[PDB]
Design a protein around this nucleic acid. Structure first.
Ligand SMILES: [Mg+2]
Ligand SMILES: [Mg+2]
Length: 445
DNA sequence: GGGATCCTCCCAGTCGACC
DNA sequence: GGTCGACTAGGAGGATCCC
């Protein structure tokens, strides 16, 4: 930030990021982003010409070359650049943007695919990776997708992570202990357009990308934290759920707070965006409440609901470690007619991820895994264990684990992808006018 | 990135003008 | 008293601060 790096210079990054911490480094790398790339003088001059009309994903691929040329040595992977020179550049170390772009525009789909894989593997460190901040810039990531679809930036000038790891430990140790899984995924760019990008949290049963595996998106709920106090309605509802695991006691639990994770959606009614779980069966209704109707202007919603109202969630009540001397395991497992809210952000995020996993394969099963946590109490064991693994004494305690399947109608998946891609284009044009963008091939890819 | 308090917008059931 | 129109109940979703 005080020492912004140049993507077009032989200066050594390492020379500038030895001292800094793992967090000031990312700030230094945050200046090697796509946005900063586009606004570079070398790139402006090149674009200023009357012939040059840059398209995607060619321009993203060019960017990848320069980025990994700059940070190759730092992250300890020179494979990306080695492939660019070996297979794309005819064996020449291209240094000018005009020539790098030309060579990039002559890549086939198999070659873009190969780069994006190499990039995913080189960033499988995730947050621990300082390039993460440079890479995710200018791209529609899973967390920007929903926003991008509603046209509601893209280019720019933790405790929660500890809880996700807990949910991950749960899935790896308790659900899929007898299978080979993958706990670490890097940043995954779209090889076909270079405007979308994601990373996966966890995958079970992967071959030694696997189209037959199970991909989990890991989330966390905290609104259902409770102190172990007699008077506490949440705690009380929890005790009933803990002793009598089932839909009825689950309902009471969910509704023990003002703003529940589950919403009852009646016939011809429009689901709100309040939370990520819906129920269509009236058995989940509590008190009659007005609800906007599903008008003919909601065929998207209706199509998505159509394909997400059959396969039920799996609810896992976890053993309280206070009663089990530390060990946290599955006390009870039951199914529930609760489904993913297709209008909630979580639906979109897993939608993008499923789309991108497709490109890296050319179907796997997709689930949202959500852990419900509570703050530790004075009598909670400090050193808890989950199967073999241990639990961080500083992280909250998981009480519930709900796994919910997600399905994506091809027709809805497409319109949403294309809507976001258009917002990206309009933003690209507005943010970088000096660039005579060529989106002809984009509107069709 | 989730949660809660506050604040805005507006659909929908309510109820007011009126004949 | 009944149709329609205007009124207001909460539904619904954004922005901020906190953590
Ligand atoms: Mg996640
Ligand atoms: Mg989460």
């Amino acid at each position: 930030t005080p020492t912004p790096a140049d993507l077009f210079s032989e200066d050594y990054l390492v020379d500038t990021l030895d001292g800094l911490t793992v967090d000031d480094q990312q700030a230094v790398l945050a200046s090697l982003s796509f946005s900063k790339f586009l606004k570079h003088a070398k790139v402006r001059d090149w674009c200023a010409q009357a012939k040059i009309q840059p398209s995607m994903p060619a321009l993203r691929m060019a960017y990848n070359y320069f980025l990994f040329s700059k940070v190759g040595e730092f992250i300890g992977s020179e494979d990306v650049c080695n492939f660019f020179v070996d297979r794309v550049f005819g064996g020449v170390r291209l240094l000018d943007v005009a020539s790098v772009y030309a060579a990039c525009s002559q890549m086939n789909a198999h070659q873009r695919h190969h780069i994006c894989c190499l990039v995913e593997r080189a960033t499988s460190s995730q947050s621990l990776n300082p390039v993460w901040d440079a890479l995710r810039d200018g791209i529609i990531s899973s967390s920007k997708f929903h926003w991008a679809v509603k046209q509601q930036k893209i280019f720019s000038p933790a405790f929660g992570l500890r809880c996700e790891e807990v949910v991950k430990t749960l899935l790896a140790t308790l659900l899929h202990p007898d299978e080979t899984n993958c706990l670490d995924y890097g940043f995954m760019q779209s090889p076909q357009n270079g405007i979308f990008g994601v990373s996966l949290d966890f995958a079970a049963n992967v071959k030694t990308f696997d189209p037959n595996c199970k991909v989990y998106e890991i989330k966390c709920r905290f609104k259902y934290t409770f102190a172990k106090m007699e008077c506490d309605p949440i705690y009380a509802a929890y005790q009933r759920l803990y002793e009598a695991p089932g839909k009825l006691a689950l309902k009471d639990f969910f509704y023990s707070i003002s703003k529940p994770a589950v919403e009852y959606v009646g016939l011809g009614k429009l689901p709100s965006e309040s939370d990520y779980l819906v129920a269509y069966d009236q058995e989940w209704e509590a008190c009659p409440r007005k609800k906007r109707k599903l008008t003919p202007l909601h065929n998207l919603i209706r199509e998505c609901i159509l394909h997400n109202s059959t396969t039920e969630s799996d609810v896992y009540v976890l053993t309280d470690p206070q009663d089990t001397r530390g060990q946290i395991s599955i006390k009870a497992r039951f199914k529930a007619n609760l489904f993913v809210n297709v209008r909630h952000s979580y639906f979109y995020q897993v939608l993008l991820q499923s789309s991108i996993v497709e490109e890296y394969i050319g179907s796997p099963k997709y689930y949202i895994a959500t852990g419900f946590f509570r703050k530790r109490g004075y009598q909670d064991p400090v050193n808890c264990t989950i199967g073999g693994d241990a639990l961080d004494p500083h992280v909250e305690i998981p009480t519930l684990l709900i796994v919910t399947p997600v399905y994506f109608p091809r027709g809805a998946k497409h319109r949403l992808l294309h809507q976001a891609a258009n917002f990206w284009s309009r933003s690209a044009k507005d943010t970088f006018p000096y660039i005579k963008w060529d989106f002809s091939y984009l509107s069709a890819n």
